[PDB]
Structure 1
């Protein structure tokens, strides 16, 4: 509703945006820790496989 006490749709959207920021922060921490932008097959499978074979 517009003046609801049961549902806070604005808080749900704010939670989604905070989760997006936290996921970006986790990615940057992995890059700082490994020194790699592609550190596993999850980052980019084709380039990861090429680098492994090379």
Structure 2
């Protein structure tokens, strides 16, 4: 409530900021590679289908 050793609200704000940062990182990768599923991590079956089709 009134804590000096810890501030939970700042931690929640950090979780929100980290989520926005991961979203912007995925957007940067999607922009620069030109692909929504550039690698197997993005989606396994879809990437395997794209690779076998290629």
TMscore range, shorter length: over 0.9
What does residue 31 of structure 1 align with?
30
State the 1:4 CA deviation.
1.1
State the 1:45 CA deviation.
0.5
What does residue 46 of structure 1 align with?
45
- The runs of 5 or more residues in structure 2 that have no matched partner are none
- The runs of 5 or more residues in structure 1 that have no matched partner are none
CA distance in 2, matches of 1:4, 1:40: 45
Indicate the RMSD between aligned Cα atoms, in angstroms: 0.5
Q: Which runs of 4+ in 1 moved over 4 A?
A: none
